[PDB]
Nucleic acid binder design. Structure first.
Lengths: 100, 517, 249, 735
RNA sequence: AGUAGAAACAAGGCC
RNA sequence: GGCCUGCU
């Protein structure tokens, strides 16, 4: 029932900024997967993992039906596919973020 | 055959004629009217005729509606505990005896002989309302009689002290007015009722906040030695035992547990002495036995309690005692917290520190306090604070584990990934692991048991009401109120002078400020 | 012999004679409950306060002729001062423990036969077999269930006549039990407890508990059987279920 | 960082952690002195909520009474006791229409019970105000004293052994010119008609202690013995009625209350479609008892008992007739202190009528000035309303009538409401197509409540969307949530005896695990703490320790004497084998197979001088007054051991002029023991009949000697000795 | 003095 | 000074 589409990824400069957005068909989470690993917690809505706290902000518009991840001061270690997720189970396909 | 006859007659009939609506003359007529009565839309007529100002209009409850609770203003709040909590000092022996095992007086004397540096006591901070020289003389008397016990053959299990004028004043002896008859005392102008008015108003101080802060901190000892249980046979029993072991590891090294043991022991000894030695003043050393990290058992002597005459008939009758406790905290920095204490200088202590060695002063907090049978009984059941707290934590764990079909205790206690808001720092709200929540709830329960009062009950009820309303607001349930000002006035009348309830009100105001966003 | 003798001794003194003469049988209960002792409002507080006294409990006068007034070191075990409104004497709790180490001994083989319910519970649990604990949300729904697992399909009054005829065969009065189930129960519990000397009142109380059906409303999830409800605290929880099979099955 | 537990509610919902908001780990508030001030305040408050009524003076008691019924309709939201007779009669009529046959049936069972009830049923009650001594005494003692006085005055119909006959005698006493009472200081005093009327219509006022949840203390009342039979019958009728009403929750327990609340919320919300909005009001009624006029209860019962035998109507109507003229004793009195002369004094409340007002403060001075006009013979007339929930069930009936009056058949509008009422508390689920509809529905419900003398506390009430509410400390949030803080005070030693305390503690742990969702590890911790406190309270330590106590020597020798020490009870200094699986087993039976036969026999010996059993009712029933609730009784499983002793009694009667009561107690107990030895079934089934003691005892001596010879120990010598001794006691009773 | 908080304790009564 | 009571 809940489909999810991520937007706002791409190639960015180190120290740059990026606004991810996840449109949907509930609490939301943002998770990431680097090419050599499984899922890493980024944010949920608020709470932020240690590797991303203070740099990144999660927000949502319940009238647009969208969750946002505002990423700032990006590091090469943030390079991952960023997946949006919905819970009462529902996972997006993920948007590629590449920081260099 | 027989017919039962229950006839109203005589005086009882006339009473029946005077217990009717205003426009009825006899019970016969009223019963006839009732039997002949049938509904013909009479509620509607009076509802239409009734004034429209009689309404229950719903006032919407929004984020901007609730205002912070006002706290009373006045002289700072004082200390009410029956013993020192944050400023206690421990003299130890490192003996292998268990909590109840041993004899009190010998242990106290042995612990006190472990300290060297005694000085002739002198006044540092006076009581400001009593006779401090009496406290000084009482301390020296206690020392002298302790030596007197040390000399003789076998340390008595319980000692009685002499009834000198010093402790006669300190314990309030022969001060109750003599009971007489009204017919003999009517012309005395000063004769009036007992003073019955609202307690004095006092504003909150910052010392209770720090005391609670350090009441939730870990320690270098285990202050709970639990009893035995039947060997676990069911897997659920194994899960319960593992959970219980985790919580015991978390809470045993906590100042709240030390306060629990202190209060339980002190109140038990005081009640037993009052029930046994009703007439004669009795000496009781404050003893608490812990276990070090190395595993060696240890005893600790905070001070002494002198119990006075305790002919307690009613549950509210008061037994007065005088408490003496060693400490290192100078009372010249927060004098308003020690309004009812007399503090002397009794020695100097040397604790190993990298700054040469401190050679700190070592003071004696001496005060006259009192309790009652109900207070003693309830203070000797302080161990149920452990229950309250850990039941709350286990309810949290079970509720979260009902989501993920698996027991979630081990990762909660080891990974420490999840955290709950358990305090606010100037930077913002601070979250701590589940163990810190355990300790915080345990400290809250302990302080509830220590600073219990009617103010606490009233504020708790009338603030739980507002907390439920605020929770409904935060849940998007369109909460409404009929008279919110009345509820606010009901809450604000419970805050008078108790430090604990005022701190709870300040916490509630902070929670409202952080909530409603 | 004795009974009528203290009867005559009572009637010898004028006050007790008047009490015996003017008081009718129906008022028996009233005067038996006639007491100045108020029912305690806070039992825990006073139990914690009385036990710190010497001689805090009460015992029949006969204790003065079975237990010595003092033990080896001289700690007093009983006092000769009677209670407030009774002929019983106040005694120390040691007189209890003393009775358990040097007091008279008897044959307690028949207590298992009397306290049938509790021993049946013990036997059922001893042979029980536990299982894995499954963690999942339990939908506890509130239902009316029978707690007593040995009820013989009798009500309170229905089994009260059976109990009297089993214990007090002469005070039955008009009633002669018709149902044959009651006949067999009377026969069994008569031949089983023929010489048991615990007390008529306790025997009657435990027979009432065992035979009379009792029901209470409880939050249950599954189970619903009488044997599965006594262990409802151990098998069902907020987020965990513990499979259990009592020894009976 | 500053620690703040309240901030925990920012992540955990309020109801999921509501236990933290219950400070039930400290001493509850207690009253210290007289309750006279509270009694006077309550009387004045009850009289001024009905000030606009009409005043009269009773021709029998001569006391001023205020009748507000059918008075002017309220024009403000303040509490008002101006109930309208026609409105309440119509409400009862609609209640009957929605539940046909309710009143007739309930009256039938009540008639059965009243005509088969016995006098002894009045002994099964707590403290009651004995007028023979003007003080509170146990129900049995007061009943016995009143029966003795009646028999001395010539009212001996109660000898029939029927409660209805006792009430007949009580009413006949009202028409006597001069009764006689006994006082010890024995003196025979004569009471005229009016004095006895006031003594029979009066109530005794005390202060309620151990009341958690409010800053101020309250006053409660206890009635006499003349009026308790009528109250019993009226409450029997009301209970039979409420048992047929699903909207009532007073005659049920807690779990039934929760089940009914869940059912009603599901019914109201589920039936509501998407267009209808639903709102729950968590309502409390301010001054519930002070605004309920006994005359209105009289009206309700006379409507209920229509088309019934006139004697039934009269006997059920006597009670509200007496409540409408009820008087209240002011209380213990007032204590004064003089610091200049350093003395104290205690003036009884009866002097408040004449004592000067120089000794009283402004508040008490004004209270006395306002209540003096109502003072008659040291007691104040309290006609306008009930004092303390004596008619709980009738009040619940009225509230249920109000609740049912909005079944959408009487509302005649889109909005409608339902809910659950338990006296002084209610939950009201109101549905309506729009917020305006909800507002109109709640407004009309409030208005109708004000027409029945019932007021809604706006300060302690709030309305939200359905799904979250409260009811009698039960917090519903999409399903009831356990609290466990209400039962915390019951986790200690009860205070009955050793075996009883052990069984009660383990059973309480078990029950709170079943009902209040107590966790396994928490239950184990509770067991450990309870065992520790139990050992420290009864001076029964493990025995292998060196904790010197007054009982540590005998325990240690018993320990060293026993071979299988695992079978020793915790009361005798043995190990604790209890666990989550063993919480439903008595200690004796759990350790039965481990005990040594010598210790087992010594422990469970019938000849022990400690065990004492009085009646079937008091075998294994313990009265534990629960926190935040009325006194309750619990069945606890225990084996009669030497540890089942009963504790010492007060013993302070010896210093009072009422010292002869102890001699009467001893003589009555001796006679009762003799009768029980003569009639073994005396305890289990209370004997009935109209003969006297000695007749039954002597005749049974005859017969038992006979038959026990026809087979048994007796011999001709002894049988004839008994026969002629029976003749001797016969001729002694002759003279 | 102290406990405590809308009234009390800080022993009572009897010789 | 001697003795009594500790929910009456």
């Amino acid at each position: 029932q809940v489909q999810l589409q991520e937007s706002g990824g791409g190639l960015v400069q180190a120290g740059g900024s990026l606004r991810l957005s996840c449109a949907a068909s509930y609490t939301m989470g943002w998770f990431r997967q680097a090419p050599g690993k499984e899922r890493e917690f980024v944010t949920a809505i608020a709470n932020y993992a240690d590797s991303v706290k203070g740099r990144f902000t999660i927000s949502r518009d319940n009238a647009k039906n969208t969750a946002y991840l505002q990423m700032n001061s990006l590091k090469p270690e943030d390079t991952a596919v960023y997946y949006c997720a919905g819970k009462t189970d529902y996972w997006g396909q993920g948007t590629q973020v590449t920081v260099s | 055959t027989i017919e039962e006859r229950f006839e109203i007659t005589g005086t009882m009939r006339r009473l029946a004629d005077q217990s009717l609506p205003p426009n009825f003359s006899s019970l016969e007529n009223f019963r006839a009217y009732v039997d002949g009565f049938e509904p013909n839309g009479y509620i509607e007529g009076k509802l239409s005729q009734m004034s429209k100002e009689v309404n229950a209009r719903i006032e919407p409850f929004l984020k901007t509606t609730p205002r912070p609770l006002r706290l009373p203003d006045g002289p700072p709040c004082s200390q009410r505990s029956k013993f020192l909590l944050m400023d206690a000092l421990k003299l130890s022996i490192e003996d292998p005896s268990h909590e109840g095992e041993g004899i009190p007086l010998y242990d106290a004397i042995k612990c006190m002989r472990t300290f060297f540096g005694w000085k002739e006591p002198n006044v540092v901070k006076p009581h400001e309302k009593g006779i401090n020289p009496n406290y000084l003389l009482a301390w020296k008397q206690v020392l002298a009689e302790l030596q007197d016990i040390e000399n003789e053959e076998k340390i008595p299990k319980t000692k009685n002290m002499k009834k000198t004028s010093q402790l006669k004043w300190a314990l309030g002896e022969n001060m109750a007015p003599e009971k007489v008859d009204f017919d003999d005392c009517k012309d005395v102008s000063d004769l009036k009722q007992y003073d019955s008015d609202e307690p004095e108003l006092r504003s909150l101080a910052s010392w209770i906040q720090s005391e609670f802060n350090k009441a939730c901190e870990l320690t270098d000892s285990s202050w709970i030695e639990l009893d035995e249980i039947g060997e676990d046979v069911a897997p659920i029993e194994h899960i319960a035992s593992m959970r219980r072991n985790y919580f015991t590891a978390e809470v045993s090294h906590c100042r709240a547990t030390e306060y629990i043991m202190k209060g339980v022991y002190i109140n038990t000894a005081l009640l037993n002495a009052s029930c046994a030695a009703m007439d004669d003043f009795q000496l009781i050393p404050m003893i608490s036995k812990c276990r070090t990290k190395e595993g060696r058992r240890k005893t600790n002597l905070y001070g002494f309690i002198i119990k006075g005459r305790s002919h307690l008939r009613n549950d509210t009758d008061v037994v007065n005692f005088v408490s003496m406790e060693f400490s290192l905290t100078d009372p010249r920095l927060e004098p308003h917290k020690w309004e009812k204490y007399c503090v002397l200088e009794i020695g100097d202590m040397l604790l190993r520190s990298a700054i040469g060695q401190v050679s700190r002063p070592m003071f004696l907090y001496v005060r006259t306090n009192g309790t009652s049978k109900i207070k003693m009984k309830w203070g000797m059941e302080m161990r149920r604070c452990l229950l309250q707290s850990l039941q709350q934590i286990e309810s949290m764990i079970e509720a979260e584990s009902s989501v993920k079909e698996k027991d979630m205790t081990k990762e909660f206690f080891e990974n420490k990934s999840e955290t709950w808001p358990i305090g606010e720092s100037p930077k913002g709200v601070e979250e701590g692991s589940i163990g810190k929540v355990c300790r915080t709830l345990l400290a809250k329960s302990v302080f509830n048991s220590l600073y219990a009062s009617p103010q606490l009950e009233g504020f708790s009820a009338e603030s739980r009401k507002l907390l439920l309303i605020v929770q409904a607001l935060r849940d998007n349930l369109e909460p409404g109120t009929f008279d919110l000002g009345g509820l606010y006035e009901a809450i604000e009348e419970c805050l008078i002078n108790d430090p604990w309830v005022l701190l709870n009100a300040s916490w509630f105001n902070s929670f409202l400020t952080h909530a409603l966003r | 012999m004795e009974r009528i003798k203290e009867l005559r001794d009572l009637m010898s003194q004028s006050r007790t004679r008047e009490i015996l003469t003017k008081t009718t049988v129906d008022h028996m209960a009233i005067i038996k409950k006639y007491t100045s002792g108020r029912q305690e409002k806070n039992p825990a507080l006073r139990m914690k306060w009385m036990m710190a006294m010497k001689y805090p409990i009460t015992a029949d006068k006969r204790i003065m002729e079975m237990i010595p007034e003092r033990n080896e070191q001289g700690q007093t075990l009983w006092s000769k001062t009677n209670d407030a409104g009774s002929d019983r004497v106040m005694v120390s709790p040691l007189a209890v423990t003393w009775w358990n180490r040097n007091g008279p001994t008897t044959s307690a083989v028949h207590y298992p036969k009397i306290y049938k319910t509790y021993f049946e519970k013990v036997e059922r649990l001893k042979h029980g077999t536990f299982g894995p604990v499954h963690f999942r949300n339990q939908v506890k729904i509130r239902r009316r269930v029978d707690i007593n697992p040995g009820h013989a399909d009798l009500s309170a009054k229905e089994a009260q006549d059976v109990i009297m005829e089993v214990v007090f065969p002469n005070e039955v009065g008009a009633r002669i039990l018709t149902s044959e189930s009651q006949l067999t129960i009377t026969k069994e519990k008569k031949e089983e407890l023929q010489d048991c000397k615990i007390s008529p009142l306790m025997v009657a109380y435990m027979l009432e508990r065992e035979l009379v059906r009792k029901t209470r409303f409880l939050p249950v999830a599954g189970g619903t059987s009488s044997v599965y409800i006594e262990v409802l605290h151990l098998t069902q929880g907020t987020c965990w279920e513990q499979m259990y099979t009592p020894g009976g099955e | 960082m500053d620690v703040n537990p309240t901030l925990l509610f920012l992540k955990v919902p309020a109801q999921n952690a509501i236990s933290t908001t219950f400070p039930y780990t400290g001493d509850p508030p207690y009253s210290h002195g007289t309750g006279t001030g509270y009694t006077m305040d309550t009387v004045n408050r009850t009289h001024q909520y009905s000030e606009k009524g009409r005043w009269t003076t009773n021709t029998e008691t001569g006391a001023p009474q205020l009748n507000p019924i059918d008075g002017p309709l309220p024009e403000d939201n303040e509490p008002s006791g101006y109930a309208q007779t026609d409105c309440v009669l119509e409400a009862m009529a609609f209640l009957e229409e929605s539940h046909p046959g309710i009143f007739e049936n309930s009256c039938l069972e009540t008639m059965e019970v009243v005509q088969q009830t016995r006098v002894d049923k009045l002994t099964q009650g707590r403290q009651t105000y004995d007028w023979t001594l003007n003080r509170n005494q146990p129900a049995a003692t007061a009943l016995a004293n009143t029966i003795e006085v009646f028999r001395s005055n010539g009212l001996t119909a109660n000898e029939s052994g029927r409660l209805i006959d006792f009430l007949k005698d009580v009413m006949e006493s009202m028409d006597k010119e001069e009764m006689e009472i006994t006082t010890h200081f024995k003196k025979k005093q004569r009471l005229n008609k009016r004095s006895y009327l006031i003594r029979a219509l009066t109530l005794n006022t005390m202060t309620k202690d151990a009341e958690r949840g409010k800053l101020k203390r309250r006053a409660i009342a206890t009635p006499g013995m003349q009026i308790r039979g009528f109250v019993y019958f009226v409450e029997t009728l009301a209970r039979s009625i409420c048992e047929k009403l699903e909207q009532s929750g007073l005659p049920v327990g807690g779990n039934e209350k929760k089940a009914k609340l869940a059912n009603v919320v599901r019914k109201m919300m589920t039936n509501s479609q998407d267009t209808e909005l639903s709102f729950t009001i968590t309502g409390d009624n301010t001054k519930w008892n002070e605004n309920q006029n006994p005359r209105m209860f009289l009206a309700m019962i006379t409507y209920i008992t229509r088309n019934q035998p006139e004697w039934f109507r009269n006997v059920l109507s006597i009670a509200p007739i007496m409540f409408s003229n009820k008087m209240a004793r002011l209380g213990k009195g007032y204590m004064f202190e003089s610091k200049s002369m350093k003395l104290r004094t205690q003036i009884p409340a009866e002097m408040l009528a004449s004592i000067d007002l120089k000794y009283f403060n402004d508040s008490t001075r004004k209270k006395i000035e306002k209540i003096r006009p109502l003072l008659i013979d040291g007691t104040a007339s309290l006609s306008p309303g009930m004092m303390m929930g004596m008619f709980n069930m009738l009040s619940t009936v009225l509230g249920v009538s109000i609740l049912n009056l909005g079944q959408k058949r009487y509302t005649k509008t889109t909005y409608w409401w339902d809910g659950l009422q338990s006296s002084d508390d209610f939950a009201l689920i109101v549905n309506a197509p729009n917020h305006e509809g909800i507002q109109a529905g709640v407004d009309r419900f409030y208005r109708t409540c004000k027409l029945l003398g019932i007021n809604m506390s706006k300060k302690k009430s709030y309305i939200n969307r359905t799904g979250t509410f409260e009811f009698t400390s039960f917090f519903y949030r999409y399903g009831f949530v356990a609290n466990f803080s209400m039962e915390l005070p019951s986790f200690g030693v009860s205070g009955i005896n050793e075996s009883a305390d052990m069984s009660i503690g383990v059973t309480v742990i078990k029950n709170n695990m079943i009902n209040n969702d107590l966790g396994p590890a928490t239950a184990q911790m509770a067991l450990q703490l309870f065992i520790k406190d139990y050992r420290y309270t009864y001076r029964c330590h493990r025995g292998d320790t060196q904790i010197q106590t007054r009982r540590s020597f005998e325990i240690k020798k018993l320990w060293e004497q026993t071979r299988s020490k695992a079978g020793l009870l915790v009361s005798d200094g043995g190990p604790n084998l209890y666990n989550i699986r063993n919480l439903h087993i008595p200690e004796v039976c759990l350790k039965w197979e481990l005990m040594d036969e010598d210790y087992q026999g010594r422990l469970c010996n019938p000849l022990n001088p400690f065990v004492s059993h009085k009646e079937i009712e008091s075998v294994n029933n313990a009265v534990m007054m629960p926190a935040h609730g009325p006194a309750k009784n619990m069945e606890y499983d225990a084996v009669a051991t030497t540890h089942s002793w009963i504790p010492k009694r007060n013993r302070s009667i010896l210093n009072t002029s009422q010292r002869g009561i102890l001699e009467d107690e001893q003589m009555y107990q001796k006679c009762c023991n003799l009768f029980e030895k003569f009639f073994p079934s005396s305890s289990y089934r209370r004997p009935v009949g109209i003969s006297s003691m000695v007749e039954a005892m002597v005749s049974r001596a005859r017969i038992d000697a006979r038959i026990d010879f026809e087979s048994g120990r007796i011999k001709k010598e002894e049988f004839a000795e008994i026969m002629k001794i029976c003749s001797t006691i016969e001729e002694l009773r002759r003279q």
